[PDB]
Write a protein that binds this ligand. Sequence first.
Ligand SMILES: [K+]
Ligand SMILES: [K+]
Ligand SMILES: [K+]
Ligand SMILES: [Mg+2]
Ligand SMILES: [Mg+2]
Ligand SMILES: [Mg+2]
Ligand SMILES: [Mg+2]
Ligand SMILES: [Mg+2]
Ligand SMILES: [Mg+2]
Ligand SMILES: [Mg+2]
Ligand SMILES: [Mg+2]
Ligand code: NA
Lengths: 260, 171, 197, 84, 153
Amino acid sequence: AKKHLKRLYAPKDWMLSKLTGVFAPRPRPGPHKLRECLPLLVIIRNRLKYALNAREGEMILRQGLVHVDNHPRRDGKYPAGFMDVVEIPKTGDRFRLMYDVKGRFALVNLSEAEAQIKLMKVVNLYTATGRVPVAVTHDGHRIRYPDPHTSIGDTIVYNVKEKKCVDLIKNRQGKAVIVTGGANRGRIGEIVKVECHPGAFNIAHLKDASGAEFATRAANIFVIGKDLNNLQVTVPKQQGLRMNVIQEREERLIAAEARK
Amino acid sequence: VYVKNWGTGSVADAANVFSAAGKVVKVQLRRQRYAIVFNSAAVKKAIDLFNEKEVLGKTVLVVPAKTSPKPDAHENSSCVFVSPIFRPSTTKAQVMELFAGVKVQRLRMYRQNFAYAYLDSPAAAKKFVEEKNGTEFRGHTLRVALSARSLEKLRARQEAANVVIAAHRHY
Amino acid sequence: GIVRSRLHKRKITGGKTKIHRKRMKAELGRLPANTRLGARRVSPVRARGGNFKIRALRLDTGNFAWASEAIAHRVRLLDVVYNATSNELVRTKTLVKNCIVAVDAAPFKRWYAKHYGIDLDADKDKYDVNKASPKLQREWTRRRRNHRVEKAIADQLREGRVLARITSRPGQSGRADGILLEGAELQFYLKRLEKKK
Amino acid sequence: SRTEDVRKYVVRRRVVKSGKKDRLKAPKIQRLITPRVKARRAKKAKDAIAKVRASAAERREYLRLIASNRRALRQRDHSKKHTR
Amino acid sequence: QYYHAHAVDATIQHEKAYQRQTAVNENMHRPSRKHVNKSGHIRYSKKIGLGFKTPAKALNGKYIDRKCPFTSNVVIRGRILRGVVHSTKMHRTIIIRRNYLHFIKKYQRYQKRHKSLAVHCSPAFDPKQGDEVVIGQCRPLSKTIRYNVLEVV
RNA sequence: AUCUGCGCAUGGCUCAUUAAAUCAGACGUAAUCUGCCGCAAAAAUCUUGCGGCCGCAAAAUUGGAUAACUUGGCGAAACGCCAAGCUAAUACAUGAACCAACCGGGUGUUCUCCACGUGAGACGCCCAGCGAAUGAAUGACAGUAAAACCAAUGCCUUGCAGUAACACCCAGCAGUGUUGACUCAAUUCAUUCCGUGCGAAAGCCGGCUUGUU
Ligand SMILES: [K+]
Ligand SMILES: [K+]
Ligand SMILES: [K+]
Ligand SMILES: [Mg+2]
Ligand SMILES: [Mg+2]
Ligand SMILES: [Mg+2]
Ligand SMILES: [Mg+2]
Ligand SMILES: [Mg+2]
Ligand SMILES: [Mg+2]
Ligand SMILES: [Mg+2]
Ligand SMILES: [Mg+2]
Ligand code: NA
């Protein structure tokens, strides 16, 4: 099977320079999809800058100094992804892997009693041997006894340290969601309606805080709160609000001139 | 002490948050409605410790309780539950020999291999339960418990349901 | 080796496909089992993924089910009587799925006597309905009240051979399981067998 | 006989070298079950029986929740029927 | 005493092998009430999704078709297409045409093109040449067949 | 050094073949296989030691081989080879009772009771783990309102209001899987699995406080 990953073929969100190397670290199979993940080596070397190169990254990772969802992960090819909690106890670092308004990965700093909570979107529900209902989540977790009201597309806020479900947010109109894929990835809005096309892709029509209306496929939405006012997780700085490109360029130019 | 907004966690032993500060006599609760726990200075200290805070997963208000501890419905009762009397194998006449001497008001059998006997005195019911619990009758180990039911309520219901039966008969 | 691809086939237009690759192991076929009636002999086949198929070469017994009674018994295969592909398979006593076989009727007869208290072998080791507890007699009456057996199966049980259809694939699983013929399917195949003595 | 000390009777070969202290080569005994190994083996069965009993407890709690919910719906239905 | 079994229906059984449905047992003495039609017979039928009504011929018919999407294990998934029946000379198979206009960028103009598809036709439809049909994508059923007739308009 | 485990089906190169092929965008696999990686699951199994199948007892103190090596070596050579003699493994083979649960099916021409048999309760016997095979049943309903008759069975008291179901040890220990759609998930019943499946690797290393949990 494929063991390598050309740097040109690597996801653009990893921000690896096309001139520095032929290859990029190929994510191993695991919790998240290869195209929708951030490798641990990329996090430790290119984002956190704790490692100058891969050899120092190996030094840090093999010692189990980096924890993902309250578990040391020693593989630099481990596929960390959305809503994962990454903690380095030695440096006192705690952040959640999320998407900013531009669709890039963002390390949102977390406090204690916040790093113990992780949201998981239910992608499948089946019955195991012994008539045991099992819920499969977006990060590959299998839950042996979910809430009876759990449905596919819902989100389970899950205590990683105690390994137990603590609450469930249903996937209904009026709920706050974050887009996890497509051109609208990273936007935060409220479900206005969901159009159902059986045998095809359901379309979710959303509306952000400023009132902008956008759409995507139902697979790309991720419920994160009862409504936009009360979210169940800390979001990045820009709060999932897409901002006009012309206005953004003008504000950056003014801010740059104010600095100098 | 009285607690407002108990939330979920209806288990009485799960209210041990007050038991940490001081001993608990009884805990009467109604799930999310409320929860009362059951010296005085210790209860006040527990009030300062837990009230106006999100303890046990919800905002709890430890207010002084104006309600007395609930009385056990089994105490001062005149009915007894008896198992495992099997109706298809035992006749009512042979059942009464178990109660012989104590004397009864009413006897009833049910398909779950249990019988309900209404005795005249609560002392008779109490004496029967204590002297016949764990005894042997009709080839099986007995099990008698004081019942929270009452004969006067059953007769009142029978009178109240007789009118409906008669009216429906004429209908 | 043997392949299952469509490359060698003609196009719907009748043109010839120009093959520009070598055969792949992922499209291979295997030689048929051609399972015959005889003492058990099987050959394991390591299939893709490391799983094993059991290529039965000879089979003599299998689990045959009475559908209307919702029961099954391990019985001996006596003969192969009909095959819808060709009568040459019958002549060679080949065992394949859906072929019609005759199996020993004794276990089904004995179960009937034990379960319903009815001995089909009236008018002439063997279960006797007389030696039964009175509770079992009452259960026999309860079972017998809502029950009617068909004469065609009942007659076949009496003769000691009952026709059945193979439901498993001996070449793939190494088993010769089946189901007793009943109702219209039995009448269909009895007419086929009645043709030419 | 069993319960003896196998380490005492192991074969030791003497290696002689000029100016050296005559190393005595002896093998490492394999399948020598020490009390530490016995504790390690017994702990495995203890964990296994603990895990299955824990699963039975989780099964019990889930079944209780389903049964209680159906009971609550039934008696709520009865209360509405009486109250009207 | 004795059970009254159903009789062989010669109008259906002419295939040298008994024709039957694999999902249900037609000889079951006590019908399960789950797959019994208005005539009292046992006949398997399932509802295909996508808002397609199961034809009455499928529900209360006597034909045996292991390739019919309403009375067999063939499921509909993938593309849903519409076409015009071009030929019905095959047994249970029909040829349909999909006529369309193809745009040529250089000349800023269209040309008429067409494609032909072999489609399985359940005995519950009986379409004719020139009819319009709706077809659903199924698993390969033959060398050329990849679609099943769902509705005749 | 050599057994063992993993990899060597990736990378690198090339463009000969190739037009219902390959490829691109877009879709399917409910038509399947899938080591490594993630999250999970695991109650089948008559074993061992001392004495005479039986008794006592319980931290299971399991068994044969083969490399390296030694000896004799064959052959011009060969990323070529014999024979004998040692010894290991997480190689190969074997094998774990009680502790230790809940649940069901078939029965005894066995007992204790009730009525003069849709009777009840015990004990005895044979089966009842994951996965696999065949058959049978489930895997829902969603197009109408009242009365009597009989048989049994619930209550009410000595005729039907009230009544989730269920003859006790559990008086709510699933009456409720999933999809757009399934013969699918899963459960129950009957029979089967003969190597072509299933150890607690009978494994390894640490920490202390050194621990038949
Ligand atoms: K090796
Ligand atoms: K080159
Ligand atoms: K096991
Ligand atoms: Mg060792
Ligand atoms: Mg390559
Ligand atoms: Mg593509
Ligand atoms: Mg065991
Ligand atoms: Mg020589
Ligand atoms: Mg091994
Ligand atoms: Mg199974
Ligand atoms: Mg269903
Ligand atoms: Na789909």
